[PDB]
Symmetry: D4
Subunit: 181 residues, 8 copies
């Protein structure tokens, strides 16, 4: 029940034991929600190396990592490459289209999927997964709907927390090896 | 009287019920008030996807959104274009001019207007609107003057908070549809 | 979904709608867990008027308030008499005997019962009730087990928080009349 | 506008200028809302010396102090005698009667009166007074209704804060004299 | 390594593994350091129920509890009797004599003893014991000397945390039974 | 320049060097400002043991401890007797008479005197003494006037902090001895 | 004595009354101390619009603004030109040289100058000016040396706070106008 | 025993006294763990001037500074050039290889080495050094393993804190010189 972020329920741990796919949102989850825009059309976004370390640990521990986001940017493709993420969907408002696509591509059951969100747009997908997750500073209306609420804020180590939770539940946390990138 | 951010007065809710136009300042409201500057003259500014979802909800729920700011940047024009904001005024030191222009263009009364500010130069317009809003971390002197002080700080989701307030007051929050962009 | 303490899940509200009996612990729930002891043999315990107002509200709005505690003190009886709590259990280490006694004396189903606890000794009862409640500053291992976690600490208005929640779910908050005692 | 606890609005300062009578609730205002009960019938309530200083200042700066509380206790009469409070009403569920009694006894208009409450039961009186005040930790549903919300919690200096505001607004803060008792 | 109060080092767990005797100070550890005094000579002190729960768990799980304190009060004997603590040393300025006697009476080595302190007077004993513990709000000069620093402050559940640590280290946590008294 | 409570100025350290007398207020300084009153006439006040330890270290290091308070209570006389304090001035609204009485009976210079206050009744004395100290939670208008401001609040170890400052400045901190009473 | 950031002493207000020149460090004062660096040699620094408004108020209200920094960047020249600052000294590791040059060029006494620093490299200049200022999050060793310590952190509104303090002291605060740039 | 960040153990101070080489991780230690990425393949990272100052102090006080990181970026090389760091290892999966290379290059024993890490990838090296340090916001599992945990978070001044600690232990802090760069 107890973790390094605090105690979690026996139900949350049992759901986490069956997770084979980890779907993430970008803005608000892998970042604090900020979009950096410039005068010459530059777009910047901050990622956390702690979350990078976690994604590497999960991908090398038989847990697939996928991303479905509403925005479309070349930088997100570059971040997926650096971490080895091959399943990526950008410009997706109705995220169930991309969700149905992953279940058909990876032949995976919805109960074996985990989703980490931060806004109300994430819920239609969170409602169908085995382990719905909302970040600490997710929109107040999403927090009570998720199976688990992270202690660490979005883009501060929230994805890492979930990665550590999935690894601990499946008995891989200590054995896990990753790159803090 | 109850919201997802905390209790509000009936006065504030009744004010928000009549709002047809939401005017926003940029620096300190849509951002955390930070101006990122570069050696080759590059300028950057950070926006929140949470605010964007709120603005996207507002514009689809028959509430116009406008922006008045003292500075001028192409990046602001891009952010407005991303969100579908068609009413934008930049390089404005007297904001009452643009305020009167919006009243004439929309055939609207000052009471149907809400204004979110963060500094003393916002007050001349806030004094005249139906709902004056100061952000959590606004200038200490502006805070006591506004009808509503937000819980969330500028650039962290304060606009979304205001958007959610206007939608709840008009019974639109439940079926509100936007994009986290 | 919206309350004055923060947003709650639909499942917590649905559970609260069918609550006809509320059971409360004393130490750490009605008080802050402190036991004032004296040289001549005095004993003191602090209660909250805010909790008193809520307890009065529930009892006048068709919700029975009962108390099960592990310590025995005359002061508890006086507080029960002031608020109108006619069902009291003191000096009870095994709380399962007192719980099954309340169900038989009032002909009530376990799903129509809500319990507010603060320690591991409270869990046996909390497992079988319809709405299990843990206070904000409850024991770390008890927090994730409960259906709902209060925002307000024990002896600071946590009982009031539950009372307000039950009244809001049953649509009795606007008509609720109590005394600040 | 600026005070030593933080800035106040020009409207609140204007409301505090007319005040001749200051009515104070006990539980949650002069105390932190705690009721200390014993096994022989002992009842204790914590008062703040800092609040006592401000009360002695108001009574010497041509401002009358009154107390209306829903509970009856001898300790309250003892505190009133220590601070020189002549007007006292206890065991009052319908506080409008004690409020109407003060208006006729002192030949004072409702706009010249100020109340400091903490719970919903205080509101019917707070509606009719010239300056309605709620403490920093007053019930969530009362806070947005008051004209002024104090920075200091109940029984921590919240009365003193109100007292300091009335003295400053009437230009008597510097020449104010009181005893820290 | 991970507990419900947060992670601890492998060395702390191994030091807590051997503990057969837990010694606690009264003021600042079992209380928040406050001494309530009266005009007629009444002396009062606050104790925490969850501390009592942990002590009840400790005594039942083959771990002796002793108390050495500098003050003398009848209420301390009353508290020790309620929880079943037989070893009590009141009016002890020099806390070395009581420590030397407890080693002789219980026939125990210094590495199987754990002391929880809060001030500089507690150090001479803590220097010799196998597990020296300082409470969260101990004197700033004692904190960096102890083997483990609690997260919970004295009189708020600090003793419980220590008890829960020893029980988990000895593997008795799941089957530990106590009373919230 | 550096203490265990944080860095202090050289001027404050030099002022604390010549200190031979330490005058303390009772309410807001030795206590947190709370006065407990019963229906029978019982009065209670809390004192911190760590605060007592510092006072004991001061008296046994050629630093006299005096007490001037606006309130009059029997319990304070008992507290002075326990801590070995011989100087007491209770029921003093005009503290300039009591301060003049200390410079005459101990034959001491104002610059060798340190005062620890909490309210505006303490400044008339503090203005003339060598080291004027305000507690962390002193009245907002007193804080800026003092030479030094404590990190710890009144009744939680504020006096101890002042005592530690005086002893280290006089180089007696390492050799100091007291009891946690 | 009263400001919108909290109470200040009569001595600090007297110092701020005579200020004609405000000297500011860049990193840690006008920014939060961060230096953004890129692979192609890009360099960014963040500034606050609230600080901008304050500087614009000072310059138009007969208070010259100067900058002395140990680093050198083109972006700083661009920021000064936007704010209308004509006195800029970059790459100065001995800030005494640029200090004496300002006193000669503007014909001004040291007591009529204010300095806002964040690290120990700022002290040699701060030691000689009429009003030395350390920011809220300045280096712990610098803080207790300054005449005034700001409530706001560097690059968050600390400069605005000082600007407001000088304007309030000189009776220019109300009449002063600026731009949120 | 006392620093400007708070008290430390004599053991930590003794370990810090021996240090001749300081090895730092970049991400989460010199920065706050954020990787800024753009659509044109730009990469930005934030460094603290306060850390830069302390690094300049270390290198001019006979304490070498080295950097080992799992990522590889040109900006880091530029940052090292600004601060005079000559020992830099990038793209380092196995940090023990770089650790072995450093000790063989500089003829230095592990006991004379300090390492400041933030994640589990740093522990293998930290296990061998004389002073292992974890930043205030390091991964929860790393914190209790280190000899010293900093008060300041990564990229906010945690590296400066370590530099200050080494200099104080070696009696160099008072006369150490650096540049805010």
């Amino acid at each position: 029940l107890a973790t390094c972020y605090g105690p979690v329920s026996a139900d949350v741990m049992a759901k986490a034991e069956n997770i084979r796919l980890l779907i993430l949102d970008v803005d608000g989850v892998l970042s604090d929600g900020l979009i950096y825009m410039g005068n010459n059309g530059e777009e910047l976004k901050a990622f956390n190396v702690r979350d990078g370390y976690g994604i590497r640990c999960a991908l090398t521990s038989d847990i697939e990592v996928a991303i479905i986001t509403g925005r479309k940017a070349k930088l997100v493709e570059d971040r997926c490459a650096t971490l080895g993420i091959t399943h990526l969907y950008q410009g997706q408002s109705n995220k169930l289209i991309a969700f149905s696509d992953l279940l058909e591509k990876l032949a995976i059951a919805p109960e074996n999927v985990a989703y980490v969100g931060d806004d109300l747009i994430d819920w239609p997908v969170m409602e169908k997964v085995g382990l719905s997750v909302a970040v600490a500073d997710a929109h107040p209306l999403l927090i009570p709907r998720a199976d688990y609420v992270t202690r660490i804020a979005g883009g501060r180590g929230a994805v890492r927390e979930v990665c550590d939770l999935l690894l601990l539940a499946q008995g891989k946390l200590d054995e896990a090896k990753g790159q803090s990138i």
